[PDB]
Write an enzyme that holds these catalytic residues in place. Sequence first.
Site, PDB file in Angstrom:
ATOM      1  N   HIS A  61       0.760  -1.054  -0.094  1.00 42.83           N
ATOM      2  CA  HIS A  61       0.109  -0.138   0.098  1.00 42.83           C
ATOM      3  C   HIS A  61       0.982   1.265   0.059  1.00 42.83           C
ATOM      4  N   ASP A  91       9.536  20.648 -26.649  1.00 44.43           N
ATOM      5  CA  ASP A  91       9.622  19.205 -25.988  1.00 44.43           C
ATOM      6  C   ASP A  91      10.613  19.541 -24.750  1.00 44.43           C
ATOM      7  N   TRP A 126       6.889   0.855   5.063  1.00 42.47           N
ATOM      8  CA  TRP A 126       7.452   1.783   4.143  1.00 42.47           C
ATOM      9  C   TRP A 126       8.908   1.931   4.594  1.00 42.47           C
ATOM     10  N   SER A 156      14.939   6.364 -12.018  1.00 44.56           N
ATOM     11  CA  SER A 156      13.714   6.818 -13.038  1.00 44.56           C
ATOM     12  C   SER A 156      13.557   8.330 -12.515  1.00 44.56           C
ATOM     13  N   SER A 157      13.447   8.516 -11.261  1.00 44.42           N
ATOM     14  CA  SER A 157      13.405   9.784 -10.511  1.00 44.42           C
ATOM     15  C   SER A 157      14.383  10.583 -10.578  1.00 44.42           C
ATOM     16  N   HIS A 240      11.954  12.871   4.788  1.00 48.12           N
ATOM     17  CA  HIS A 240      11.307  14.006   4.702  1.00 48.12           C
ATOM     18  C   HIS A 240      11.157  14.920   3.551  1.00 48.12           C
ATOM     19  N   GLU A 242      11.310  13.611   0.733  1.00 43.19           N
ATOM     20  CA  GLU A 242      10.403  12.786  -0.237  1.00 43.19           C
ATOM     21  C   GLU A 242       8.919  13.124  -0.056  1.00 43.19           C
ATOM     22  N   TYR A 244       7.906  16.077   1.048  1.00 40.29           N
ATOM     23  CA  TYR A 244       7.952  17.136   0.371  1.00 40.29           C
ATOM     24  C   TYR A 244       7.882  17.271  -0.918  1.00 40.29           C
ATOM     25  N   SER A 255      -2.342  26.299  -6.432  1.00 40.02           N
ATOM     26  CA  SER A 255      -2.393  27.600  -6.651  1.00 40.02           C
ATOM     27  C   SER A 255      -2.615  27.920  -8.157  1.00 40.02           C
ATOM     28  N   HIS A 290      12.770  14.456  12.936  1.00 43.67           N
ATOM     29  CA  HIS A 290      11.210  14.635  13.749  1.00 43.67           C
ATOM     30  C   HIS A 290      10.583  13.147  13.650  1.00 43.67           C
ATOM     31  N   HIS A 291      11.001  12.303  12.932  1.00 39.74           N
ATOM     32  CA  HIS A 291      10.741  10.909  12.826  1.00 39.74           C
ATOM     33  C   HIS A 291      11.867  10.236  13.726  1.00 39.74           C
ATOM     34  N   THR A 316       5.088  27.603   5.090  1.00 35.65           N
ATOM     35  CA  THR A 316       4.306  27.107   4.701  1.00 35.65           C
ATOM     36  C   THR A 316       2.946  27.779   5.020  1.00 35.65           C
ATOM     37  N   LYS A 319       2.633  30.466   2.682  1.00 37.62           N
ATOM     38  CA  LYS A 319       1.911  30.033   1.473  1.00 37.62           C
ATOM     39  C   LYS A 319       0.435  30.026   1.802  1.00 37.62           C
ATOM     40  N   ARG A 438       0.878   1.670  15.092  1.00 33.51           N
ATOM     41  CA  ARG A 438       0.706   1.115  13.852  1.00 33.51           C
ATOM     42  C   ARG A 438       0.795  -0.414  13.307  1.00 33.51           C
TER      43      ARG A 438
HETATM   44  C1  HEA Z   1       2.382  15.146   2.202  1.00 31.73           C
HETATM   45  C2  HEA Z   1       3.256  14.516   2.789  1.00 31.73           C
HETATM   46  C3  HEA Z   1       3.706  15.208   3.970  1.00 31.73           C
HETATM   47  C4  HEA Z   1       3.847  16.676   4.384  1.00 31.73           C
HETATM   48  C5  HEA Z   1       3.744  17.827   3.883  1.00 31.73           C
HETATM   49  C6  HEA Z   1       3.930  16.637   5.837  1.00 31.73           C
HETATM   50  C7  HEA Z   1       4.403  17.762   6.615  1.00 31.73           C
HETATM   51  C8  HEA Z   1       4.654  17.743   7.895  1.00 31.73           C
HETATM   52  N1  HEA Z   1       4.914  16.724   8.592  1.00 31.73           N
HETATM   53 FE1  HEA Z   1       4.885  14.570   8.438  1.00 31.73          FE
HETATM   54  N2  HEA Z   1       4.871  12.745   7.592  1.00 31.73           N
HETATM   55  C9  HEA Z   1       4.469  12.159   6.436  1.00 31.73           C
HETATM   56  C10 HEA Z   1       4.012  13.005   5.254  1.00 31.73           C
HETATM   57  C11 HEA Z   1       4.039  14.481   5.220  1.00 31.73           C
HETATM   58  N3  HEA Z   1       4.185  15.277   6.350  1.00 31.73           N
HETATM   59  C12 HEA Z   1       4.427  10.765   6.406  1.00 31.73           C
HETATM   60  C13 HEA Z   1       4.160  10.009   5.095  1.00 31.73           C
HETATM   61  C14 HEA Z   1       4.878  10.423   7.641  1.00 31.73           C
HETATM   62  C15 HEA Z   1       5.159   9.128   8.308  1.00 31.73           C
HETATM   63  C16 HEA Z   1       6.001   8.061   7.527  1.00 31.73           C
HETATM   64  C17 HEA Z   1       6.101   6.867   8.242  1.00 31.73           C
HETATM   65  O1  HEA Z   1       5.912   6.930   9.451  1.00 31.73           O
HETATM   66  O2  HEA Z   1       6.481   5.856   7.628  1.00 31.73           O
HETATM   67  C18 HEA Z   1       5.319  11.763   8.445  1.00 31.73           C
HETATM   68  C19 HEA Z   1       5.341  11.747   9.745  1.00 31.73           C
HETATM   69  C20 HEA Z   1       5.715  12.796  10.336  1.00 31.73           C
HETATM   70  C21 HEA Z   1       5.906  12.844  11.896  1.00 31.73           C
HETATM   71  C22 HEA Z   1       6.260  11.484  12.509  1.00 31.73           C
HETATM   72  C23 HEA Z   1       5.494  11.426  13.868  1.00 31.73           C
HETATM   73  C24 HEA Z   1       6.283  10.337  14.783  1.00 31.73           C
HETATM   74  O3  HEA Z   1       5.993   9.038  14.194  1.00 31.73           O
HETATM   75  O4  HEA Z   1       6.627  10.483  15.965  1.00 31.73           O
HETATM   76  C25 HEA Z   1       6.119  14.141  12.301  1.00 31.73           C
HETATM   77  C26 HEA Z   1       6.378  14.834  13.523  1.00 31.73           C
HETATM   78  O5  HEA Z   1       7.347  15.660  13.755  1.00 31.73           O
HETATM   79  C27 HEA Z   1       5.718  14.959  10.833  1.00 31.73           C
HETATM   80  C28 HEA Z   1       5.727  16.423  10.933  1.00 31.73           C
HETATM   81  C29 HEA Z   1       5.277  17.129   9.952  1.00 31.73           C
HETATM   82  C30 HEA Z   1       5.243  18.384  10.028  1.00 31.73           C
HETATM   83  C31 HEA Z   1       5.557  19.134  11.358  1.00 31.73           C
HETATM   84  C32 HEA Z   1       4.833  18.795   8.679  1.00 31.73           C
HETATM   85  C33 HEA Z   1       4.500  20.234   8.105  1.00 31.73           C
HETATM   86  O6  HEA Z   1       5.362  20.557   6.870  1.00 31.73           O
HETATM   87  C34 HEA Z   1       3.240  20.805   7.789  1.00 31.73           C
HETATM   88  C35 HEA Z   1       3.073  22.468   7.679  1.00 31.73           C
HETATM   89  C36 HEA Z   1       1.765  22.671   7.026  1.00 31.73           C
HETATM   90  C37 HEA Z   1       0.902  23.562   7.627  1.00 31.73           C
HETATM   91  C38 HEA Z   1      -0.340  23.841   7.172  1.00 31.73           C
HETATM   92  C39 HEA Z   1       1.651  24.365   8.800  1.00 31.73           C
HETATM   93  C40 HEA Z   1       0.473  25.032   9.618  1.00 31.73           C
HETATM   94  C41 HEA Z   1       0.276  26.322   9.279  1.00 31.73           C
HETATM   95  C42 HEA Z   1      -0.723  27.248   9.405  1.00 31.73           C
HETATM   96  C43 HEA Z   1      -1.892  26.484   9.470  1.00 31.73           C
HETATM   97  C44 HEA Z   1      -0.802  28.669   9.019  1.00 31.73           C
HETATM   98  C45 HEA Z   1      -1.401  29.431  10.185  1.00 31.73           C
HETATM   99  C46 HEA Z   1      -0.544  29.254  11.470  1.00 31.73           C
HETATM  100  C47 HEA Z   1      -0.588  30.010  12.174  1.00 31.73           C
HETATM  101  C48 HEA Z   1      -1.156  31.348  12.138  1.00 31.73           C
HETATM  102  C49 HEA Z   1       0.312  29.904  13.316  1.00 31.73           C
HETATM  103  N4  HEA Z   1       5.189  14.106   9.961  1.00 31.73           N
HETATM  104  C1  HEA Z   2      -0.075   8.184  -1.538  1.00 29.69           C
HETATM  105  C2  HEA Z   2      -0.060   7.619  -0.158  1.00 29.69           C
HETATM  106  C3  HEA Z   2      -1.272   7.166   0.409  1.00 29.69           C
HETATM  107  C4  HEA Z   2      -2.712   7.018   0.322  1.00 29.69           C
HETATM  108  C5  HEA Z   2      -3.529   7.724  -0.888  1.00 29.69           C
HETATM  109  C6  HEA Z   2      -3.542   6.372   1.278  1.00 29.69           C
HETATM  110  C7  HEA Z   2      -4.553   6.123   1.148  1.00 29.69           C
HETATM  111  C8  HEA Z   2      -5.465   5.406   2.445  1.00 29.69           C
HETATM  112  N1  HEA Z   2      -4.789   4.769   3.314  1.00 29.69           N
HETATM  113 FE1  HEA Z   2      -2.754   4.873   3.873  1.00 29.69          FE
HETATM  114  N2  HEA Z   2      -0.785   4.836   4.283  1.00 29.69           N
HETATM  115  C9  HEA Z   2       0.386   5.268   3.210  1.00 29.69           C
HETATM  116  C10 HEA Z   2      -0.048   6.193   2.259  1.00 29.69           C
HETATM  117  C11 HEA Z   2      -1.317   6.346   1.808  1.00 29.69           C
HETATM  118  N3  HEA Z   2      -2.499   6.009   2.016  1.00 29.69           N
HETATM  119  C12 HEA Z   2       1.431   5.213   3.994  1.00 29.69           C
HETATM  120  C13 HEA Z   2       2.699   5.836   3.639  1.00 29.69           C
HETATM  121  C14 HEA Z   2       1.369   4.423   5.425  1.00 29.69           C
HETATM  122  C15 HEA Z   2       2.404   4.024   6.406  1.00 29.69           C
HETATM  123  C16 HEA Z   2       2.646   2.481   5.762  1.00 29.69           C
HETATM  124  C17 HEA Z   2       3.444   1.928   7.046  1.00 29.69           C
HETATM  125  O1  HEA Z   2       2.555   1.795   8.163  1.00 29.69           O
HETATM  126  O2  HEA Z   2       4.708   1.249   6.833  1.00 29.69           O
HETATM  127  C18 HEA Z   2      -0.384   4.023   5.035  1.00 29.69           C
HETATM  128  C19 HEA Z   2      -0.814   3.337   6.189  1.00 29.69           C
HETATM  129  C20 HEA Z   2      -2.365   3.277   6.254  1.00 29.69           C
HETATM  130  C21 HEA Z   2      -2.734   2.369   7.221  1.00 29.69           C
HETATM  131  C22 HEA Z   2      -1.955   1.766   8.356  1.00 29.69           C
HETATM  132  C23 HEA Z   2      -1.909   0.320   8.270  1.00 29.69           C
HETATM  133  C24 HEA Z   2      -1.531  -0.338   9.666  1.00 29.69           C
HETATM  134  O3  HEA Z   2      -0.798   0.465  10.252  1.00 29.69           O
HETATM  135  O4  HEA Z   2      -2.015  -1.252  10.325  1.00 29.69           O
HETATM  136  C25 HEA Z   2      -4.049   2.237   7.130  1.00 29.69           C
HETATM  137  C26 HEA Z   2      -5.227   1.778   7.756  1.00 29.69           C
HETATM  138  O5  HEA Z   2      -6.365   2.519   8.109  1.00 29.69           O
HETATM  139  C27 HEA Z   2      -4.068   3.258   5.680  1.00 29.69           C
HETATM  140  C28 HEA Z   2      -5.514   3.334   5.213  1.00 29.69           C
HETATM  141  C29 HEA Z   2      -5.574   4.000   4.070  1.00 29.69           C
HETATM  142  C30 HEA Z   2      -7.161   4.486   3.362  1.00 29.69           C
HETATM  143  C31 HEA Z   2      -8.043   3.652   4.195  1.00 29.69           C
HETATM  144  C32 HEA Z   2      -6.637   5.105   2.195  1.00 29.69           C
HETATM  145  C33 HEA Z   2      -7.822   5.698   1.328  1.00 29.69           C
HETATM  146  O6  HEA Z   2      -7.646   7.316   1.387  1.00 29.69           O
HETATM  147  C34 HEA Z   2      -7.608   5.150  -0.077  1.00 29.69           C
HETATM  148  C35 HEA Z   2      -8.365   6.097  -0.999  1.00 29.69           C
HETATM  149  C36 HEA Z   2      -7.521   7.006  -1.707  1.00 29.69           C
HETATM  150  C37 HEA Z   2      -7.260   6.840  -3.164  1.00 29.69           C
HETATM  151  C38 HEA Z   2      -8.139   5.877  -3.637  1.00 29.69           C
HETATM  152  C39 HEA Z   2      -6.338   7.909  -3.797  1.00 29.69           C
HETATM  153  C40 HEA Z   2      -6.940   8.364  -5.153  1.00 29.69           C
HETATM  154  C41 HEA Z   2      -6.521   7.545  -6.297  1.00 29.69           C
HETATM  155  C42 HEA Z   2      -7.114   7.263  -7.179  1.00 29.69           C
HETATM  156  C43 HEA Z   2      -8.744   7.523  -7.060  1.00 29.69           C
HETATM  157  C44 HEA Z   2      -6.984   6.308  -8.393  1.00 29.69           C
HETATM  158  C45 HEA Z   2      -6.034   7.366  -9.110  1.00 29.69           C
HETATM  159  C46 HEA Z   2      -6.642   7.359 -10.703  1.00 29.69           C
HETATM  160  C47 HEA Z   2      -6.865   8.317 -11.236  1.00 29.69           C
HETATM  161  C48 HEA Z   2      -6.574   9.613 -10.666  1.00 29.69           C
HETATM  162  C49 HEA Z   2      -7.484   8.136 -12.600  1.00 29.69           C
HETATM  163  N4  HEA Z   2      -2.984   3.803   5.328  1.00 29.69           N
HETATM  164 CU   LIG Z   3       9.503  14.308   7.934  1.00 31.17          CU
END
Ligand code: HEA
Ligand code: HEA
Ligand SMILES: [Cu+2]
Lengths: 514, 76, 227, 47, 44, 260, 93, 79, 57
Positions: A61, A91, A126, A156-157, A240, A242, A244, A255, A290-291, A316, A319, A438
């Site tokens: 997944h 192109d 993951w 590829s990336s 992290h 990735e 972003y 935007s 932070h992880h 952010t 933004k 998890r």
């Molecule tokens: C789309 C992907 C994405 C994005 C953007 C982010 C964004 C952020 N992530 Fe996260 N993160 C993940 C994907 C992402 N993360 C994934 C996939 C994991 C787990 C992977 C794994 O466990 O395998 C993870 C895990 C993860 C953890 C791990 C927790 C733990 O396991 O202990 C933490 C903790 O610090 C964290 C923090 C953040 C923070 C602080 C931001 C920030 O960048 C968010 C900033 C966005 C905002 C919107 C800020 C709020 C600001 C406003 C609302 C404006 C107004 C504010 C004021 C007026 C004060 N992320």
């Molecule tokens: C892109 C990243 C992504 C997306 C979309 C999702 C989507 C969803 N995830 Fe996922 N999830 C992860 C990334 C993602 N997850 C990661 C990185 C983990 C951590 C793995 C780990 O623990 O190691 C995780 C873990 C995770 C768990 C933890 C499992 C466990 O710890 O036991 C669960 C269970 O509830 C869950 C549920 C779901 C559900 C219910 C959706 C639903 O939202 C599904 C519906 C969303 C879609 C279907 C996406 C839209 C796409 C299409 C509609 C098809 C595209 C085609 C066209 C546009 C033409 N996710």
């Molecule tokens: Cu991170």
Amino acid sequence: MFINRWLFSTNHKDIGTLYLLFGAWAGMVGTALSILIRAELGQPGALLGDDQIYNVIVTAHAFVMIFFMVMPMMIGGFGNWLVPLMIGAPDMAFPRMNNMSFWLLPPSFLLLLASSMVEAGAGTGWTVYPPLAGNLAHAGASVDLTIFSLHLAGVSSILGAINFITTIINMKPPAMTQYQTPLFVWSVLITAVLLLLSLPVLAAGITMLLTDRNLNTTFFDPAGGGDPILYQHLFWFFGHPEVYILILPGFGIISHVVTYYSGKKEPFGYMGMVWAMMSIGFLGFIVWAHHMFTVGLDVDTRAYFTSATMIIAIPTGVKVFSWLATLHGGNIKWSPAMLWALGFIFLFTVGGLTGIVLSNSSLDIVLHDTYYVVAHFHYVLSMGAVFAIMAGFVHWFPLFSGFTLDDTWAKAHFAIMFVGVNMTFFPQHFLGLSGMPRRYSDYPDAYTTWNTVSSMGSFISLTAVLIMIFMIWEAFASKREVMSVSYASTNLEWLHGCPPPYHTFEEPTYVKVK
Amino acid sequence: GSARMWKALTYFVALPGVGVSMLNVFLKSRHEEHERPPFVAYPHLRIRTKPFPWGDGNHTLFHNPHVNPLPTGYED
Amino acid sequence: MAYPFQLGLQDATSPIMEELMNFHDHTLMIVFLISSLVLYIISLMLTTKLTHTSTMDAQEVETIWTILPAVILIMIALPSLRILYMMDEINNPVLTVKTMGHQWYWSYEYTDYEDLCFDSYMIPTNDLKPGELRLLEVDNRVVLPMELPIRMLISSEDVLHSWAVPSLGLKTDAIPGRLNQATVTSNRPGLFYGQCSEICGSNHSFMPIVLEMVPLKYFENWSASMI
Amino acid sequence: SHYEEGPGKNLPFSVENKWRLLAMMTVYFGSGFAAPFFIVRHQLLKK
Amino acid sequence: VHSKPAREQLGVLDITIGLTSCFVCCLLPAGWVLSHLESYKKRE
Amino acid sequence: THQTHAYHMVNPSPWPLTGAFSALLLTSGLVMWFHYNSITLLTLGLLTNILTMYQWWRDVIREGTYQGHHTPIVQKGLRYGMILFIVSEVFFFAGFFWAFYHSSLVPTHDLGGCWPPTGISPLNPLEVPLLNTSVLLASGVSITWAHHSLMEGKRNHMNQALLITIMLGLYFTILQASEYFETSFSISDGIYGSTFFMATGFHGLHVIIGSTFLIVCLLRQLKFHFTSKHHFGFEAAAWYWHFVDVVWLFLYVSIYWWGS
Amino acid sequence: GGVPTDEEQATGLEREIMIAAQKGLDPYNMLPPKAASGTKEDPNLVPSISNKRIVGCICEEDNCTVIWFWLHKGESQRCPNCGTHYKLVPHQM
Amino acid sequence: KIKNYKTAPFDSRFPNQNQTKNCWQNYLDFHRCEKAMTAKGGDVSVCEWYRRVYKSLCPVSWVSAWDDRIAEGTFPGKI
Amino acid sequence: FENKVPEKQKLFQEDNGMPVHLKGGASDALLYRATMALTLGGTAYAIYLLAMAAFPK
Ligand code: HEA
Ligand code: HEA
Ligand SMILES: [Cu+2]
Ligand SMILES: [Mg+2]
Ligand code: NA
Ligand SMILES: [Zn+2]
């Protein structure tokens, strides 16, 4: 003709076509994996038996949804369609390695499928944290297949990032300042730069792990002076940046759709937009631990990492406020793309704030690897990046194929998937705060009710996936064309025909002398 | 003028420098007849968790029987 | 012990948990502030009708839009460093308890005097004696005294684990060759339940943590009564 | 010119027959949604 | 974005077939595996 | 005359497809070699990959010098992309140095608490690695003399510089293999042996790749492909070799002196 | 003697633009154009090999957003939001 | 000394959560203690404190493994 | 060695309809059929070996 045009493609339009097809197929596979996970997590008990196979399901997944859906959808796909049409390029700079990277992707997906075939399975997540992925806990080839799939996707990336950076900073018209391009070009430029600086990091980490297993070395073996903490450091220095990567073209797409359908000829604060993009790009590399707040790091290091994580939080927010400002003052055309953009703004806001609640360090000492983190990244990714993908998909579909979308059915899709993902992803706040970790195939009695609610919402999201694929069929069957497109004066991609021909920009754009 | 200068540096600095470094190693390799260290089965050395995918799985790719003992000892 | 229909945290037993929950609802009132603000702004421009598509002035509002969220983040971050200093305080180690995460179970070691090591297994659903909780109970509980700061030296044997008791407020990764130190305190006796939080094979969901804390006299009575 | 262009002509699949298009989208997305379920049944048979 | 009329408009019956058509073969595989997991489970 | 822009329109080519599937064969054959002891898939993958790369760069040269499709802005894109490739393996080897530094700066209790770990005598860094870094520096000064001999524009020094660089690189590879054969520890010998041999092996593979660049640039100059101003093949070979030289300097300093 | 010189070695599009660079006229758009004066009697001259060509007015100083529109053959059309004139001339190549 | 205590104190030199290095230092300075006092004829039971502190800090599996390293001559440390 | 670039510069600018990867002559077409016959044959042999790893006896 078929094998000459599509298997040996050298034009970015059809390259993005095949990106879109592969991303849709990967979205199908990831949706099926999520539905299977929720089939575990809708009723207590071993529906499958052991949880090793469940860990295989969640690993597939994560891998399929990150590396094969989101990046090929918006980074490869939307970038490859848009950025030559965005900057007036005829192109891409290196279409031959662009085609190489595309056709590198299905071998990675096939290697991951073979990993699922192998009876050991990829029971790691993951994170491929050793010594779980070592020769003792996983005596098999499945994790090697996953590592090689990561190799394929990584090269590829890297190739796509090189091509994108070269195309962006080379073949804009020569009188254009680099601070004059549309913001999706800037977003994919910062995306490709961070790809270039973070994908060799995964290459180093997974070659380290591959050598650790197969060649009797001790990089992460505790019985040879190694340490898995090094792999955690390398993998999150990947990780992290990735995530972003997975969010920045989302920023660009939202935007663009906001400044399109809001009626503004320009987004608010272009310099602030580009500055915030480069700022979160720059700070994305120094907040990787932070992880790592529960692993056992030094406490001053933890304090620095949470402080720098607040420093990545601020621009952010700049933004987001610039998005609200460019929404301000404009008449809102109620296309579904605005519905996706508004859903992105609110749900990304609450997901990022959930990320901040995680980002407080002792709150991770209570709250690491629970379902609170699951709620965080499914808010900010599983419908942040997904809603941005949907916004770009329903926006540029008349440009991609020539056939429009009917607003009533498209909004029906939006409303059902919004309700489904909210019902799916809102209970894991309570699930994580109540304290279940998890990767569990069965849950205790306190978590039963919210797990059932989340699974029911996930089935709602599945019905939304059905209505989306029906809608793609309905558009391709009704075949109603495009009479006209507004805001093509500001958006360069829409003025070269819907769809644009095979050979676009054979005559270069006449850029003003100033 | 640049190309001449670089030609002069290559012929009068780089080539004599490589000659002196080669002569240093060549003289050392004729005087040094290293006393193979005694075998000690240190638990952190010669680790074999999985056999190698070549030969008997116990010899390294650049194995040298004179200097590289197996987990059990020298081969002689 | 988590109860059905739970929205917050398991209630505090440790003073460190007391400051965690105080700071937690501080962060919740902050996030509710920002969420309500962005909701009203979004509702404002979706409910409006006037138009302004002229040249918009950019260099006037980013100053406040940069400085006041900086104040919000720094007042968020200051208690985080305060609680980090609370974990950075010195110890009064009346006891040292070592946890060793083995493959799909735990082993707990009391070695300060008369070394004893016991195995925390998993009880099955069919072998659950009547009245217990499912997926949590262990045949051999982990005995601590109350009201005493005790060292927790946490490692694992062959695979990564994560010792995590959310009620008391501890979560550290059990890493082979790297044992972390956690300060365990509370204010009450009784049972406390937690889980393993890192993936560790085919029984990852089947490693719980049960800690029973009672008066010191009963603690050495237990330790003498086993041997 | 060298390759045919137009609405629906820049796709790798034919569009003119909507029922054939429905069949190919059905089998395509069905294989996509059915791959992990056949993974889990194959592993259940193997275990 | 104004759109030209559908070249091949779908009738009430066409929409019915379209929606069901996929739902059917986009959930049929899922149903089969999930519904028989217990059999599949049999090592037999 | 059909394009007015000065950019490059690539004709359709099968080698993206075949190179990607040859990478599939390479990784799959690695799996079969590690787990199912069948080398044949790996050999077929190596053959397909090397042959695909041969014809790919063949077609690149054919559209370069036999057709003149590398416009100034096209080769500006080429040098930008080569710079991006260089920094890609800069960060790759930087991650490797991060692994080495995390191993060395904080030694664990399984190494005796000291660096290098006890049990095996480390290699002497004063004689043979010094000869190696002198070889790399001589090769680098020969490359910059060769490019200045392109600027002056004359073939005899051009050819002499290219042959002496290729001989130096081949000598460095032979000495690298010799010191692999003449060392007291293996890759399965501790963390220090593991990271040292893996880092030096990756660097030596990169040296072999750069030697292939210098060989193909020599055979391209002997066939008069290069000219006075458009010599991007030698420019790319020069940049790759300077990257190799600075990576060997970093590896030399760090591993061979920092805690030895 | 020595290496060949690209002036009599390289042929093709590279040679054509090399001749263009020596003669000082750029017909293949490697450099920004000139004559930034768009009055009615003196419009901006846009050379096209076809009947129609994309132009972009950067009609304000340091404007981050460009204005994209086509020209067709004929009378001098104005930039839609500033009003400077452009006339399209056939290149005849 | 011959003091009576409860557990190992908080060593200010090692103020972080990692105490593998703490029991490492305890095992090494217990052994250098034992060899130093049996070399210069001091009291060998003066760092029973050091024996009990490594027994408190690091696990029984590690202790028995390291004692087997002593018994064979395999110990990687500087003893 | 002799400068054979301009005579090979005439054999590739011929607008005879072959793409850039095939203008050199019969050697290139033979080599392209050869790299098709072992890549596709290798890929078909690769998926058979993966299936044989997937399904034991
Ligand atoms: C789309 C992907 C994405 C994005 C953007 C982010 C964004 C952020 N992530 Fe996260 N993160 C993940 C994907 C992402 N993360 C994934 C996939 C994991 C787990 C992977 C794994 O466990 O395998 C993870 C895990 C993860 C953890 C791990 C927790 C733990 O396991 O202990 C933490 C903790 O610090 C964290 C923090 C953040 C923070 C602080 C931001 C920030 O960048 C968010 C900033 C966005 C905002 C919107 C800020 C709020 C600001 C406003 C609302 C404006 C107004 C504010 C004021 C007026 C004060 N992320
Ligand atoms: C892109 C990243 C992504 C997306 C979309 C999702 C989507 C969803 N995830 Fe996922 N999830 C992860 C990334 C993602 N997850 C990661 C990185 C983990 C951590 C793995 C780990 O623990 O190691 C995780 C873990 C995770 C768990 C933890 C499992 C466990 O710890 O036991 C669960 C269970 O509830 C869950 C549920 C779901 C559900 C219910 C959706 C639903 O939202 C599904 C519906 C969303 C879609 C279907 C996406 C839209 C796409 C299409 C509609 C098809 C595209 C085609 C066209 C546009 C033409 N996710
Ligand atoms: Cu991170
Ligand atoms: Mg983990
Ligand atoms: Na379950
Ligand atoms: Zn204007």
